[PDB]
Structures are given as C-alpha cells and as structure tokens.
Amino acid sequence: SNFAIILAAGKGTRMKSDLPKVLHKVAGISMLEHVFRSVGAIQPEKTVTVVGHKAELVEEVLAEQTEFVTQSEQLGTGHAVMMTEPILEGLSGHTLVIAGDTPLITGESLKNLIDFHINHKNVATILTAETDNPFGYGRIVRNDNAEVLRIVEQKDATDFEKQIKEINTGTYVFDNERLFEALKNINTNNEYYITDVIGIFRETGEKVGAYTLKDFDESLGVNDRVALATAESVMRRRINHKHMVNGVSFVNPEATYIDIDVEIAPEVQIEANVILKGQTKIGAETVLTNGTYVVDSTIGAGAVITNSMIEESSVADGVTVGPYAHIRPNSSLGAQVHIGNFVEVKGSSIGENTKAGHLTYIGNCEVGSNVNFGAGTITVNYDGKNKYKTVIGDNVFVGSNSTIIAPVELGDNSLVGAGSTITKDVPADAIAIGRGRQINKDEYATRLPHHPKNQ
Amino acid sequence: SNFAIILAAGKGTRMKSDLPKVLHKVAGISMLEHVFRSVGAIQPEKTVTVVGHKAELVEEVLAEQTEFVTQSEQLGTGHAVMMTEPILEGLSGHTLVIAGDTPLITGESLKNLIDFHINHKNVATILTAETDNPFGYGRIVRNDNAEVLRIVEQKDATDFEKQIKEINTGTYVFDNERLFEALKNINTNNEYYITDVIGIFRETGEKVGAYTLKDFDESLGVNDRVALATAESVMRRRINHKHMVNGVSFVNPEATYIDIDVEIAPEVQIEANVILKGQTKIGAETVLTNGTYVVDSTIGAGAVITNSMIEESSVADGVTVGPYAHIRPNSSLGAQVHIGNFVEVKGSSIGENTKAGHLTYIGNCEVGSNVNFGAGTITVNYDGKNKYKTVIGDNVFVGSNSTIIAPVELGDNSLVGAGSTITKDVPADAIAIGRGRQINKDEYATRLPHHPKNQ
Amino acid sequence: SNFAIILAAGKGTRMKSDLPKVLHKVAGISMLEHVFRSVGAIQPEKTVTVVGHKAELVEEVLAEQTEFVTQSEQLGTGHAVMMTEPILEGLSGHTLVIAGDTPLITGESLKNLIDFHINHKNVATILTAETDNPFGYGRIVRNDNAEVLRIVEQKDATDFEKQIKEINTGTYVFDNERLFEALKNINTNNEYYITDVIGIFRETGEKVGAYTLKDFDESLGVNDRVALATAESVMRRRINHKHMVNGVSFVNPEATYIDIDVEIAPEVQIEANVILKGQTKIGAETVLTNGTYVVDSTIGAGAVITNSMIEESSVADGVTVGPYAHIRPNSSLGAQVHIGNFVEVKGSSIGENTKAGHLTYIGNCEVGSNVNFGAGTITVNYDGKNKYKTVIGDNVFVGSNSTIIAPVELGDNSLVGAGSTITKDVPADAIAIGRGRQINKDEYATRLPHHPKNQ
Ligand SMILES: COc1cc(OC)c(S(=O)(=O)NCc2ccccc2N2CCC(COC(=O)CCC(=O)O)CC2)cc1NC(=O)CCC(=O)O
C-alpha cells in the first residue's frame, strides 16, 4: 500500500501575495494541483494534505480529492508530518512526503522513486538531484556501497562536503510504521524536521537510500515569482512537446501558451503567441494564427481562427473567424460561418453558412442559416434595464449599417435596407426600409472647409 | 563535374500527416526546398530527386528544378540511390547524396564538403558532426591517419565505440563512377544501404574521408513535429541574423517570424512578434510594431505599420496603418495615406494623403487624393449577387457614419453629410444629405429605464 | 574623489545607421544613458563625456548631466582621453574610463571595480571578464602574485597567450594624476591607445591590477544590431527579474517588453507579449493580457487591460479596457469605466462607471458618470478645419449607431435614439430622435438577389 502526504501549509514571504503560495497557477491550474496529479501515479490508498495558512482556499481547490489536516502554526516539516499521524499511524505501507510547491516533479519520477524504495528495501529513500551549483541545498553524503549516510545542510557543511553535487529535493518515501515511530521519538525529544528521521534511522542502522532525478529542473521548489515563471516555462515546453509528438505543428512552441487540460487533434497548425485556456478542444486541421486567444471553447475541424478571442463558446467545422473578432460567452457559430474583422458575437447562435464580415455587433440573437450581415450592422438588445432577444430567420439579408432594435423578428428571406433603423418585425419575404432620402445641392461644397479652394 | 542526388521518398509515421514529410514548411518554404537551395551552392550539373510517396505533390514543388525518379517501394537508401543509376551511371564526377529532410545544412557547408573530398582524393566522404549525446547515431571509427575505417550502428556497437562523439549525418560525396559500380555489386549480392558502399570501398582499400560540420544543429534530420519546430527556430535565428547584420533593428529576433524570401531595407525597426510572409518587401526606416502581419505585400520607406494585417497589397512611402487595421488582397495605399484603428480596405486603390482613421470599411473603391472618411463610414458593394464599384474623386469629404451604396460616384470636392445613406451620384462640388431630422421631446427621458430616478 | 570619462565619439560602420551608435536604444533609453546610470553608482565628482560624430544629438541626450569635450577626429582611445585633460589634469582621485557602448555594465560592478582599485593601491585596474572563446580580445597576462604584466592583442599574441581566458573589457580605473602624466608621455612620443598607459606603468613598475566581472555578458560591447538585440535580451531579463522579485507575475518574462523606467506595483499579472513603454505606472492587482501596449500612461489598481493600446493617458482603479480598444493621447478613464472591443477614445475625459462596449469613437468629449454609449456610436468633431468639443452630462443614454455632430451638448439624463444623427443640443431629461421611419413592403424580397428562389 502506498500513501501520500502533501505539505501545503506554507508560510513564507517572497511571493508578496495574499494568495497562499501553492495556489499560484502554472499552465492553468495551481502548483498544488500539479503535485496532486503526479502523486496520483503511485495510486495512493490515502492522500493527506497538510494545510495551514488560508486553509479554506486550499480546501476548496482539492475538495473531495484528499483528506485534510491542519497545522495551526509553523514548527517544521516534522511537525507538519506529525499532523497526519492520527490518519496514518500504524498502517503498513510506503509513504511519500512531497511539498505542494514542487509542481514539476512528474508522476513517472514518483513511480520510479517508489519502485526504487521497495526494490532496495530501504526504510527511507530521499529523492535527490544533481547540480553543478549546490549552494544552499542539503547535500547527500553516501558511503561507498552506496547508502545514504546523511544529509548535510549548507550552514553545517564542511568544505569537502560543500563540493557534493547530489542534493536533497525535500521529497521522500518512508516505510510508514517506522516513519511515525521515529517522528514520535524526535517529538518527545524536542521546531523539528523530517530530515531528523534520517538521523534516527542511521542511529538504528536502518537502510536509507537515494533515488536521483534524471532532470534537475524537475526538482524546482517555487518560493517566488521568478521561480514560478521558471515553472511556467518548463511546463509549457512539456505540454507543447506532447502536442507536437501528437501531430500538432508549432511555429514556436517556446512562446505558445496552452493550459494543461487543453485538447488538440492531430494536424492542427498553431502560430506563435497563441493562447488556449481552460477546457478548450481544437479539431483536426484547424489553423490558429498569432494572437488567437480561446478560453473554455470547442473549435471544430478545418476551422481558421485568425487573431481573435473566443470565450465559452462553440465553433463548428469549417468556421473562419477574424482577424480582430471577439466571440463572447454562450455563442455558437454553426458550420462554415464566417465572422470577419471587428465583429463581436455575444450570447447568440449563428446558423450554418451565415456571414458577418465587418464592423458588426450581434448580441442576444437567434440567427438562421445563409444570413448576410452587411458591414456596420448593430443589434440593439439592452434599453438600460431589460435585455431583449432578436430572432432572425434563414437567408435574411440585413443591409450594411443598419440598426436592429430588439425585440424584433426578421422573417425568412426578409431584407433590411442598408442604413435603416428597424423597430418592428419584418415578415418572411418582405423588405423593410427606414432611412432618409438623399438630397443633392449642387455647388454648395464650394463654401465648406474641406474644399480645395478654402485651403 | 558535381552531381546531386536528393532522397525525398520518405515513408515514416511520426509526423502524423497526410502531407509527405519533406513538403512540411520551415520559414515559408518546404524542407525539401531548403535542401535544394543548399545543394545549388555546389553548382551541380544534374540534380536527381528520388520521390516515392505522393510523388506528384513533391513533383509540383520542384517542377523544372530537378530530374525525378521514383522508388516504388521502401528498400533502403541503397535502393533509393540505385533508382538514379539510369541517369547517373558511368558519368565522371563527384556526387552528393543528401536527404530532403535535413533542411538546415548550408550551401557553405556543402561546398566545404565537396572541396574536402576533391582535395583529399577521397573516393567517399561522409559529412559528420560531433555531439556529446551520440545515442542512436552511427559512429565514425577512424584509424590514426585519420581515414574512416567504418561506420558503426548503435545496435552493432561495442561499448568503447558507443563513446565515439563523431557521428554520421547521412550526407555523403562519392566519386560517381565508383558509387554506381559499388552499388551494383551490393545489389546483385542481396533492403540495402548507402552505408554498404563504405564497406565495399574499405574492402578495396579505397580512401574514405570524413568532413566534420562545425555546427551540429545543422545536421538535424526532421522526423516529427518537435524537430520541425527545432528547424524553424534555427532558421529564424539565421534569417533574423542576416537582417540584423544588414541594418534591421529587432526588439527580439528570437520571437519575430520572417520567411526566407522576405526583403528588408536597412534602418527598419521591427518589434517582437511581427510576422512577414511570402514575397514581402519593406522599405528603409519603416517601423513595424508588435502584432503586425504582412503577407505578399510591398511596404515603402518611412511607413509605420502598427499592429495590423496586410495581405497581397502595396503600400507607398510614409503610410501610417493601425493599430488594428486590415488591408486585404489587391489594395494600394498611396503616399502618406493614413489608415487608423478598426478600418478594413479591400480591393481598393487609395490616392495619396487620404485618411480613414476609424471604424470604416472601404470595399472595391477607386479613391482620389486628399479624401477624408469620417469614422463609421461604410461602402456597400455587394447585393447578394453583383459586386459593384464606387468611384470617389479627389478631396471628397465622406461624413462620419454614412453608407455609400455602390455603384455610385462621388465627384471631386463633393461632400456626404454625416449619417447619410447615399444611393445616387453626387456631382463635383455638390453636397448630398440623406438623413432624418433631429426632434427633441422635453422631459420624456424621465420615463425611460436609464434615468437616475427609475433606478 | 572619483571621476568618470565616458567615450562616446564612436566612428564605426556596422550599425548602418545615421544615428550615432551610442544613441541606439535598449529598453527605452540610449546605450549611452544606461552607461551614465551605472557610472552614477561611483558618485563621480566630474563626468566628462567625449563626443565626436554628431556631437549635438549626443549633447541633447545628456544635456545638464555631464561636461562634454570633443574629439575632432579618430586617433585612438588615448587621444579621446586626452581631450578631457584640460578638465581633469592634475586633480587627485580615481578616474573610470568607460565606453558609451557597453550598456550592460552595472553600477554594482563599477563600485566593486573602484573598491578593488583603492583597496589594492593599484595605479591602474583593468575591468576584465572570462570567456571560453577569447578570440579577438586582448588577453590579460598576469604573473603569479598575480599582478597584470600586460594586455596582449590577438594580432600580437603568442599561441600559449591565445589560450588565456581573461580578456580586457576596455573599461579601467586609473589614479588620475598619473593617468594624465602617462598620456602626455605617450603623446609627445607619437593614433595612440589607452592601453599604452598600462605599458608606461609597467616600465615604472607601478601596480597594475585586474578586477574580474562575475558575469561575462555584462561586458558586451555593442558594434552592430545583432549585439544591440543581445543587449536588449539581457536588459529585458534584468528589468523583468526586478519586477518579479517585487511581486509581479509574468507568464513569460523572456518575451514581455517593459522599459527601464516603467513602475509596477506588487500583485500585477502580466501575460506574455505585453509592452510597457516610457513613464508608465501600473497599480496593484492590475491584469495586463497578451498584446497590451501602454506608452506613457498611469493605470490604477484592479484594472484589466485586455489586448489594447493606451497612449499618454490616465486610467483609474477598476477600469476594464478591451479586447481590441485604442485609448489615444490625453484621455482619462474614471473609476470602473468599461471600454469594450473596437472602441477608440481620443482626447476625452470619461466619468466614472460610464460604458462604451462596442464599435464606438469618442473624440474630444467631456463625458459625465454613468453614461451608456450603444454600439456603433460616433462622435463627429472635425469638419475639415475646426475641431469641436462635445459635452455629455451624467447618466446620458446615447442609443446605438447614432452620430453626435459637435459642438453639441447632451444634458444630464438625456437620451439619443438609436440610429439618430444629432446636430443640436438635447436638454437635460429630454430625448432626441433623428432617424427615418421603418416602412415594410410585403413579398418584395422575392425579387431580390439574396432570396433563396433566385439562387
Ligand atoms: C450594392 O449592394 C447593396 C445595394 C443595396 O441597394 C441597391 C442595398 S439596400 O439594402 O439598399 N436594398 C436591397 C436591394 C438589393 C439589390 C437590388 C436592389 C435593392 N434595393 C433596390 C432599392 C430598394 C427599393 O425600395 C423600395 O422598395 C421602397 C418601397 C417602394 O418603392 O414601393 C430596395 C431593394 C444593399 C446592398 N448590400 C448590402 O447592404 C450588404 C453589403 C455587404 O454584405 O457587405
């Protein structure tokens, strides 16, 4: 049986944030959540997360995923572990202790760590990593066999010891029953540290091993925003790598921003500086061009989103959007819809093959198929208090620069004259014209400011 | 005499693409095309490209640049070379064999390789490179003199051999007559490999040399999208380096996207995240700001394109465009034209010094010089079936938010009243007003929803 | 007493620019200005900048910050120093000689250099740096004690010397009185070089030391645009690091463009590809999304700027702007103002809680609080010659797609009908309607082009 303890009871200062550190986001979810997902690879029978500062925010994020215990004050990693004792005391198994601020440790690394632990019959295994700049890290001193002898902190290190490149990531697997017996010994003999338990086990000459991360960047502990941006870069290359391996082309995967749960079908083409966030799905052969920003939306197959922002919406196959369009929450663009430059669609369903190419606002409308909106078309939905709905049937022709004042209905095949203000229904097959009549006055431009003579 | 054989008969799986691998683009042209351009540096008398999968797509891309031969099925690099035998058999000269999927090898490297080959009287020269991680590569085993003894594959390598850092890039120069005699020997004695020919030459103790690429990244073989994005990064730094050496300033040449044939005059200033594609030309002192996207367009000298998209158009000296404007195919912006924010110009010619600063669509128009378009101006060109042309003379003043319904003509110096719908011609020096007359109704706002009392 | 001499009398060719080299910008100010700011850390009693080519442009930039001297022609770094002799000759102190084209040397490095010089009682101290590729640099030859023996140029170097990794950055501290005596000796015995003075001091066996930069990139001399972009990258990481340490989150600090004097409060969140320029200030908890571009503007606390461009303006707490909006010079957005997509505000003050969500131009207006602008609203301010002002009171409702022709006044609580053209004042509490009346014609759509039957 595997257990997991997650330390998320962080008090520290360098984030300069009211938000507790582990809840700071990387690729769309909290650090603490990345860690929970790696922890899931060991299939723990119990996961206890230790909360402290702003416990309830943390508890909202992992609600129903983990048991919680609270450490009422800072007193070391030892005390933090000791808060889990009433849940874990005496159970037989292997317990991972991991911090909620090392969001880059992979599930695959944690499985390798638990496997090493079990296979070598360690009582403790320290997850280590190798760096050419170990300043500040506790060092792993091995004897020649090559068991861990001890962990030596910077401030207590000899000069030969300072040259050890193998350092303590602060992540461990312990035989569970022994972990708690040792902690109680340390507890009654005393701020205490989980590293103290390594001391106890060397005193009883129980076997302490060390499993070395192949990639040191995975060991990053995030204490400030500079490390958080480092984590972000690392995770971005990771997620974009997965996308590319699956058949997604990236002009620049080092500068394209795709959250952890975004899904992307093979043959997608993504230019640099594209942003996909939340529960976004992109269908096969879809092209996303530089500046495109999609939050919580489904885009179908064969679409082209050019430099446009799509929020909480659904977009069918073959749709073209942009450049410079805004699809705002609860819109649906049916198959082969064209939305052009400087068009906003808000809360509206747009039937298949319909076109709005320019300078148009469609707000709170239900629109049929094969509709044309001339440039400058405005739907008017909000009077200061009520929001009204417009219903536009199939094959309606809304002439350029007209104003459709809801609640109105445009019937199938109707037409609205360019420049009209529309305040009443237009039946199927009817036209409606609400505009003023051109009157020319010869020669009069001669007396106006723009005229070349008056210059 | 130099000859070149290009291997482009790729079957492989990791691209997950219907598009044959060598046709995947890097900086605006196919890998295979980058390779053809490096191959051109050796001035070959014959270039034979070996096609296989989807031969005709490949043949379209190199049409009239190379002879083609087809390998009907996968049977090794040896067989692929052997398909060129009826073209090259018996000719006297030095033959480069190169893959169409190594798009970063430079012309200058290939010239250095052919020079080394000729000067050292090699019968074969392997293009090699040095890496600290040679896993998976065939290794170059030299004796002390230091001729090539052999090429050792991973799966056949001794452990001392596994530590060789000199690896086979899979690019070679051969004495031509000997290449084909050796291949026929291997052929009749047998999937066969071009590497087998190195074996034959060591059997006859003919001289096999090795020319080492100074930059290992040049040796990249692209097998999947992760390598394709690597190639893209490498080529981007290359092209941007050339631009900078020639006098172009880059806020961030690591994140600016300029295709291989774009031309850029000295003194240009390019912010990060700009995109130039296709046959684009940018004149002296032109400023391009972050987000700008130019495809197949000529921009003159002293212009400022702020965050705007210009397609298949021509833009004269001194023009300012943006932010957030769209110049769509077949437009011309004359000298000192201003196009402002949220303006689309489509298929229109705009005479010198004309201004459209806001929220305007100019579609299918011929526009004179010194024209002003007030904000919200819409040209209406398409009725559902016909597309019409508008003709606007010099010094016309089109008032804000008016609607110009084509086919109409606005004569020199004419003026259109703000808010008008225009459906007939306006003569030179005339004004035209087609709008409704303001009627005020005192106190009535008191009974509407927006009014502070009704809140 | 410390003195500083800055060499800014650059003639060279590889910039391909009319602009003198040191005036080329990095993060919003000239190289020469970065250098002046590092020089300020030593608290010099005198700073003399040596100008040559286009002296007056240079003199404008440092006007009132430094004494100037002119070198009328290229004759070496020795001559350039010698131009400062009438200002500095005979004064007792330590003189830094530094080039105006090494914009990455830090104030902290220069203080460490002056401290080393004084503490070791050097007569000269060369600022050195260590690189694994020293080709082209003069090398520092030390004896074992380990004083500087000499500086050896590439073209005069022995082969053992060519392997020295310690190179001359071309920055020095000198005992001032000795500097000038030595230069005059070299002068009367002779193009001459500041390095010649090291020769003189070794002849008199005066103590020549060397202080080694910890970071070699700091030593970059900018001679062309490729190095200028390198400087830009280095400075960008520096400025963004400072921001992060202070509590600003960066999705990608390697691709976010913040000038040297921009100020940013803790808890700000900045997506990649954001641009802050000039004297911009960003308040606490403000969110800036990808594409945002702010020049010389103050943004208050709790605002959200989504993909929008703000120039020379002021923006209060809680304001939301974007996506795709343009705030142009001399605008003020009061508290909780919403500016939505495809809206331009130019030279206007917008009272608190006012909303313009779409497709609107507000030009030269004074706007009260709680105003609503329906989509498509256009203010008309310029007639070809005069620019007029519009005054819009509190709680005005300007209906969608209307045209407000200045000079007009909309009184408190007034309403303008959607689609209206407004040419006269609307009193407080009045409505104004200036639009044409809808007329429907049944069945007539049947004979138009869009109709499904006519397809
Ligand atoms: C040229 O494109 C248009 C022309 C046009 O009127 C000629 C109108 S209109 O809207 O003014 N009129 C419709 C129309 C279409 C084709 C041919 C003729 C017409 N109109 C002819 C004039 C009108 C006659 O009005 C009446 O019937 C009044 C009542 C009576 O006389 O009894 C209507 C049809 C609209 C457009 N196009 C667009 O608005 C869309 C542009 C785009 O998609 O970007």
Ligand SMILES: COc1cc(OC)c(S(=O)(=O)NCc2ccccc2N2CCC(COC(=O)CCC(=O)O)CC2)cc1NC(=O)CCC(=O)O
């Ligand atoms: C203030 O800027 C404008 C004012 C204006 O009317 C006063 C008009 S207008 O278009 O309504 N009229 C033209 C005009 C210009 C200057 C001075 C006066 C006028 N108009 C005065 C009222 C009109 C009189 O109408 C008739 O002649 C009716 C026939 C008759 O009485 O016989 C026309 C000129 C346009 C603008 N400006 C813009 O549209 C462009 C804005 C931009 O570039 O962003």
Ligand SMILES: COc1cc(OC)c(S(=O)(=O)NCc2ccccc2N2CCC(COC(=O)CCC(=O)O)CC2)cc1NC(=O)CCC(=O)O
């Ligand atoms: C539905 O939203 C609107 C409706 C509307 O008329 C019903 C008008 S209106 O501008 O045409 N009229 C104002 C109005 C509001 C609420 C309820 C009624 C009205 N109008 C009723 C019709 C009008 C009657 O006109 C006259 O009084 C003529 C004179 C007379 O009969 O004596 C005015 C009020 C405006 C809007 N909304 C917007 O423009 C803003 C949209 C946005 O913020 O994006």
